[PDB]
Amino acid sequence: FELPLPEGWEEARDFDGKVYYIDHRNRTTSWIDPRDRYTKPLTFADCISDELPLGWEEAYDPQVGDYFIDHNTKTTQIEDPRVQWRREQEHMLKDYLVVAQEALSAQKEIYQVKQQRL
């Protein structure tokens, strides 16, 4: 569905005929369609569509509930593979925080007590 502008917003044209948007609630103007907040990715890493990748299929069973089918590997799983993938990203970053922090603290405990070997 094509959203209408939010209440208080108005589409306008500048002296050159370029479209811009007027926000009457905040008495401001913008080149940015305020509907872009819902339809454009937030960053270059974001993706608005949640559609599953090639070969994956959402499925349902009255006892198990929602689950997922991977036609690529001929397997099924309960966990959302999108969530799984994100968490494996997250886990790799967190593992590094822990490893790096431990390394840095060990390096500093050594550097210190070279003058406190005593």
Partner: peptide, 15 residues
Amino acid sequence: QLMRYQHPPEYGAAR
């Protein structure tokens, strides 16, 4: 950058 940033019209332009 070689193109200058163009700001939108101020609030309250002619209708």
